[PDB]
Amino acid sequence: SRKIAVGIDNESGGTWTALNAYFRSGTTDVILPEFVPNTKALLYSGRKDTGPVATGAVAAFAYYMSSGNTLGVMFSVPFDYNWYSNWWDVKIYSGKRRADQGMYEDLYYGNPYRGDNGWHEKNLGYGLRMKGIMTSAGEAKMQIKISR
Amino acid sequence: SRKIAVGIDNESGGTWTALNAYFRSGTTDVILPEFVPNTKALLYSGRKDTGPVATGAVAAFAYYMSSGNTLGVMFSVPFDYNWYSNWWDVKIYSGKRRADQGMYEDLYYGNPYRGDNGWHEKNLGYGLRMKGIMTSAGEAKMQIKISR
Amino acid sequence: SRKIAVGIDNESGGTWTALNAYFRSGTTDVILPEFVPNTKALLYSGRKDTGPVATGAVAAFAYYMSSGNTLGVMFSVPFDYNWYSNWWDVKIYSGKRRADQGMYEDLYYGNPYRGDNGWHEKNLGYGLRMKGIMTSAGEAKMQIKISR
Amino acid sequence: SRKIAVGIDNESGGTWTALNAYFRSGTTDVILPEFVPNTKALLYSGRKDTGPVATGAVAAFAYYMSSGNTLGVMFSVPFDYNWYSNWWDVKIYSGKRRADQGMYEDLYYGNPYRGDNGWHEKNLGYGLRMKGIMTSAGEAKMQIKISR
Amino acid sequence: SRKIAVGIDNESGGTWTALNAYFRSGTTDVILPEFVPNTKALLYSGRKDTGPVATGAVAAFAYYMSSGNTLGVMFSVPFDYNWYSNWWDVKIYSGKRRADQGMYEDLYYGNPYRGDNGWHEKNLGYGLRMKGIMTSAGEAKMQIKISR
Amino acid sequence: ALAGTIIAGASLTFQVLDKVLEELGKVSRKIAVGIDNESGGTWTALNAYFRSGTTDVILPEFVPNTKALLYSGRKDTGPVATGAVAAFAYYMSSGNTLGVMFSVPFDYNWYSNWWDVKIYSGKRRADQGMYEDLYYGNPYRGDNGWHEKNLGYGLRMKGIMTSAGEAKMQIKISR
């Protein structure tokens, strides 16, 4: 039972606009919301693919803020923890950058915060910064505080 | 199992009238809602045939806007993903064009948007544009925004 | 079948900032609440990992006192009471100290209070005294009152 | 399937605070009430060890009153009623006395009242009088009216 | 599946004080209430022993009339209807008498009332008069209108 | 309301009859009992002799004038194949015993639905003789139809049930 709940807050004073959600592995059961206005919250979810397949649920999605840049946020809940370990990363990409294979490659193989059930903080730049955390359970929970 | 639930935004400036629900593959448990008023949402569904039958889920839908043309839309959630994938496409067919094999071969075999759970935007013509996305999961649900 | 509900009262008069929650074994279905206002008691839980795996519910977690100090709380809920038992403790670590393997080892191998369903008192220093308990049951509940 | 519930009235003219609960066998899924103010009825419960164990929920708990002494209450719901039997007693102990193995055996091997489903009254002393009961059922339930 | 709900109304003009509840076999899942005030209805219940044991729920209990006398109720629902049958009786005892083995002896071989769902009427003496009835099934009802 | 709660004589209709019938819970041999009180006196609960069958609710102790009663019955719950065939005796305040019977057997293949209402002389507690005399005087078959009988002593009866085991007493006791 692998699934992830994603919650991101928008305080930056601008309107957030949906770009896409790329899925290296796994799938979602809910369509990602097209808008999350200022002083509002975002909800997203995912799950391991139906059927007895030994693969994780690894995906990322891109979100367009009113600032004209794009958040790159990822999650990775794996089926096997023998080698795979849960990871999550947040970055802001200049301009309108669509989430894709390369976005997950960059965020996963850059400095993705370990899913050690610990809050992680860093300045995303562009006057924006993230406070996020994702749990290490087989069914993971994630929550990101985007701060200006 | 693959059951589809389709919602579409009618912000095209004209109330839509349901013409027919051409189901290339699979069937549904609800009737194509006849009227889609302005500033409302149109909900429909579809699902594989009951029983262990190796046939996918494809249907093509037509609606008559007040602009004098007809929207041509279809969905495709295959039975076996080993050889096919999720697909969709949105078009406007001139005048009175009922849903049939026509739009299915014109769109699914034309330039269909991949069912990769990504937001797609293009000008449908006649001063109308579409904004849709549908998850790659078998149990998928899609939102397609039609605006003038 | 092991789990533990964790609740901490914040009488200290200052909001507690969530730092992290290191888990030596086991995971959680809830995230660490980022803020703990004064006169507001925390709610949290920990649980045994999915599967017939011999893993316990043993973890430590810390918060940031508004006084600029780190308050760390540990619990111990083993799966096998034959070789182990319930254990819990609080130890305050000056400044910003992250909960880690060292946190868990030091709290579990210092003077941790037995989960004998018995209330325990000790002034944790820095003008803060802990009053707490956690039941011997494998599906225990933990309640700690932090008094100034 | 053995069960024991504890409800103690407090007409002692002062505040009551929980000291600890000692369980020779069994455990409780609830927290000892840190406070049972005057003219307010205590709430407590317990049950045998979950699993195929041939041990009942035989236990006792020491509870502190504002009078300056400890009220000690024991219960004995056995697993094998064929050799064993239901039991309960309450003794008053000078100063702060903590429930332990000695406390359990004293309240068990002293003059404990039978699980006769019948009210028992005896002068506990120190201005405190006891009127209590608990059923002979395996799901025994105990109620004591502590009055002056 | 042997059980009985036992009720008595206190019209006698004074509060009734609970004394005890002697049991030869069977037990109750609810503590016998401490008092039955004037113009109030008492609720009691009992059940057969847990486990596949060839036993019924036969017992008795006593209450103190505030005028200064003890009233006691007998009930008997056997497990094996092939040989034994339901029986019940009530007669007020002088002063304060505890329900016990002798109480149920005198109340079960003491001309018990045949609970064939038919009213049983006699004067208890001391200015008090009973009125009660039960069914003959394993789940009978015990309602007594004690009146002056 | 409840089987046993007193309701007005006009209130004891077929609707309330089936309501109390279904209130007890669905068993094949289930009987609803309710007797219209136009007898000119308050009825007193004598007893309910049960050669067979059982029930949950109690005889209404007081049945005031212009105020009928409610009652329900149910088949036995055990390893015995019998129906809810039984009877009970009432007593109007006019000074006589109101004796009613209700035969709702488990097996309609051999036995059949029957009922009968009589005013037995004096204080006549319900017993085996009660039910047997009511069943062998003139047992009214469960024909889903009314049966009218002069009860005597300035009393008469008008009652009915269903044919099947889902019996339903709504009997009008008049002058």
Task: Locate the domains of chain D by residue range.
Answer: 1-148
Closest CA to F2 of F24, F26, F29, F35: F24
Task: Report CB contact under 8 Å: B117, A50.
Answer: no
Mapped onto helix, strand or coil, the DSSP state of residue E117 is: coil
Nearest to C31 among A116, A133, A139 (CB): A133
Mapped onto helix, strand or coil, the DSSP state of residue F19 is: helix
Strand partners of residue F25 = none
Q: Which residue in chain E is spatially nearest to F88 when comparing CA positions?
A: E118
Task: Report CB contact under 8 Å: E20, D141.
Answer: no
**E-state strands within chain F:** 7-8, 30-37, 43-47, 62-63, 67-68, 71-74, 86-92, 96-103, 114-120, 140-141, 147-149, 156-159, 166-174
Q: Which residues of F touch E118 (CB under 8 A)?
A: 47-49, 125-126
**E-state strands within chain D:** 3-11, 16-23, 44-47, 57-65, 70-77, 87-93, 113-114, 120-125, 128-134, 139-147
CATH class of F1-175: mainly beta
Closest CA to F159 of F142, F175, F134: F142
- Amino acid residing at A116: D
**Nearest-angstrom CA–CA distance, C75 and C97:** 18
Task: Report CB contact under 8 Å: F50, E143.
Answer: no
Residue A44 tokens read as: 């997203």
Instruction: Provide CB contacts within 8 A for A101, sequence distance 6+.
Output: A22, A24
Q: Which technique was the structure solved with, according to the deposited record?
A: cryo-EM
**Nearest-angstrom CA–CA distance, E19 and D145:** 14
| B109 annotated ligand binder | yes
Q: How many CA atoms lie within 13 A of C52 on its CB side?
A: 0
Q: Which residue in chain B is spatially nearest to A29 when comparing CA positions?
A: B140
Nearest to E27 among D1, D119, D135 (CB): D135
**E-state strands within C1-148:** 3-10, 16-25, 35-36, 40-41, 44-47, 57-65, 69-77, 87-94, 113-114, 120-122, 129-134, 139-147
Q: Which residues of A touch B139 (CB under 8 A)?
A: 29, 50
Strand partners of residue F86 = F102
Task: Report CB contact under 8 Å: D50, C138.
Answer: yes
CA distance F48 to chain E (A): 5
CA distances from E123 to B17, C100, E114, F61 (A): 85, 79, 17, 18
Q: Which residue in chain D is spatially nearest to C2 when comparing CA positions?
A: D50
Suggest the residue from C8, C117, C131, C139 to mutate for an interface test with chain D (most D CBs closer than 10 A): C117
> Which chains does chain A touch, 3 or more C-beta pairs < 8 A?
B, C
Instruction: Provide CB contacts within 8 A for B72, sequence distance 6+.
Output: B60, B61, B62, B90, B91, B92, B93, B97, B99, B103, B106, B107
The total number of residues shown for chain E amounts to 148
Task: Report CB contact under 8 Å: B137, A49.
Answer: yes
CA distance D62 to chain C (A): 9
Instruction: Provide CB contacts within 8 A for F107, sequence distance 6+.
Output: F81, F83
CATH superfamily of domain region D1-148: Cytolysin/lectin (2.60.270.20)
Q: Which residues of E touch F47 (CB under 8 A)?
A: 117-119
DSSP code for D103? H
| A22 annotated ligand binder | no
CB A67, CB A128: distance < 8 Å: yes
